Amino acid sequence: AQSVPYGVSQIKAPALHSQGYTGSNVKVAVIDSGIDSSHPDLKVAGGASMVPSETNPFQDNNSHGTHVAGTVAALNNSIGVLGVAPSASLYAVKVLGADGSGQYSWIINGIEWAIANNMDVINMSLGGPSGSAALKAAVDKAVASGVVVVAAAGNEGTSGSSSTVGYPGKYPSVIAVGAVDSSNQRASFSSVGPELDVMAPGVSIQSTLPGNKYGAYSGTCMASPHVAGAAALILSKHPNWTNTQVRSSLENTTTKLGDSFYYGKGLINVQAAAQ
Ligand SMILES: [Ca+2]
Ligand SMILES: [K+]
């Protein structure tokens, strides 16, 4: 039997699914550790590896990219789990190695790849403490090209009165996503700052793992894909909307939680955002 992870329901995805809006024909790039294309609950359309030593993007030696991919797009069938946009065209852009780290060059190459291959949405469940002119130029070009760019805010928790949002989530062009639990409480590890945009479920999120497995992970890395998937649903309903429109709709229809420093605009609600 198929199980519907709490977080998919929490953001009100199933309402859209029942209406026939499932993300069909929207290309979502998962820029991460690759995706196990052999998982029965996923269908990978394409992608590319930017890691010099790991040339196959469809082999996930880490597990992280397969888990993020499941949240976006696990298939609607009689097994496994169910993604936010189960019909989305899923691309694996492998920029992290088996150890779950990668060089900035690799990540940026991956962003460039996604722009050149006309991805509609990019998900980056990754971040570092520092930016670069090249990282900023790449996300900016993506948005200027009409792509919706979403990223995890980071897992650095609080630090006095300072922002702890990582890059590239810190850039204005990117939607930075923090994590709540099933009670809508902010997860203690979720990064904070004025650059935080929205929240999505990020604690004990069940999804796909390599070798026909499922399991839970926690992090803003797990929250991000909910938003990327939500953007795909919106695009499936309103194919003519610009990235700006998609983003404003998500931000302006949230369930407001606490202060924006900790919660951004609040918890996304795809039902409301999809109008
Ligand atoms: Ca399934
Ligand atoms: K941001």
Among all bound ligands, the one having the nearest atom to the CA of 127 is 2
Q: Which of 101, 74, 87 is nearest to 214 (CA)?
A: 74
Distance (angstroms) between ligand 1 centre and the Cα of 103 equals 33
Cis preceding linkage at 172, omega within 30: no
Distance, CA of 73 to CA of 83 (rounded, Å): 4
Answer yes or no: are the C-beta atoms of 207 and 214 closer than 8 Å: yes
Distance (angstroms) between ligand 1 centre and the Cα of 185 equals 28
Distance, CA of 225 to CA of 241 (rounded, Å): 20
C-alpha torsion sign, points 130, 135, 140, 145? negative
Among all bound ligands, the one having the nearest atom to the CA of 3 is 1
Distance (angstroms) between ligand 2 centre and the Cα of 165 equals 8
Among all bound ligands, the one having the nearest atom to the CA of 175 is 2
Distance (angstroms) between ligand 2 centre and the Cα of 134 equals 16
Q: What are phi and psi of 62, to 5 degrees?
A: -100, -55
Distances (CA, A) of 41 to 31, 53, 67, 80, 141: 19, 27, 11, 6, 33
Distance (angstroms) between ligand 2 centre and the Cα of 213 equals 33
Q: What is the CATH number of the domain that holds 26?
A: 3.40.50.200
Q: Beginning with the edge strand found earlier in the chain, give each strand of the sheet holding 44-49 in spatial order.
A: 44-49, 89-94, 27-32, 121-124, 148-152, 175-180, 198-201
Distance (angstroms) between ligand 1 centre and the Cα of 40 equals 8
Distance, CA of 226 to CA of 224 (rounded, Å): 5
Among all bound ligands, the one having the nearest atom to the CA of 169 is 2
Among all bound ligands, the one having the nearest atom to the CA of 39 is 1
Q: How many residues does the chain have?
A: 275
**Residue 144: both structure tokens together:** 């200027």
Distance (angstroms) between ligand 2 centre and the Cα of 226 equals 16
Distance, CA of 142 to CA of 115 (rounded, Å): 6
Q: How many domains does the chain have?
A: 1
- Alpha carbon of residue 251 to chain centroid: 15
For 48, the 3-state DSSP assignment is strand
Burial readout 45-71 (b: 16 or more C-beta within 10 A, e: otherwise): eebbbbbeebeebebbbbbbbbbbbbb
**Residue 24: both structure tokens together:** 């069909």
Among all bound ligands, the one having the nearest atom to the CA of 194 is 2
Distance, CA of 210 to CA of 252 (rounded, Å): 36
Q: Which of 207, 202, 162, 161 is nearest to 178 (CA)?
A: 202
Q: Which of 247, 250, 243, 241 is nearest to 269 (CA)?
A: 250
Distance, CA of 268 to CA of 117 (rounded, Å): 28
Answer yes or no: are the C-beta atoms of 97 and 33 closer than 8 Å: yes
Q: Report every protein residue that has its C-beta within 5 angstroms of ion ligand 1.
A: 2, 41, 74-75, 77, 80
Distance, CA of 71 to CA of 154 (rounded, Å): 18
For 45, the 3-state DSSP assignment is strand
Which residues share a beta bridge with 175?
150
Provide the residue range defining the domain that includes 137.
1-275
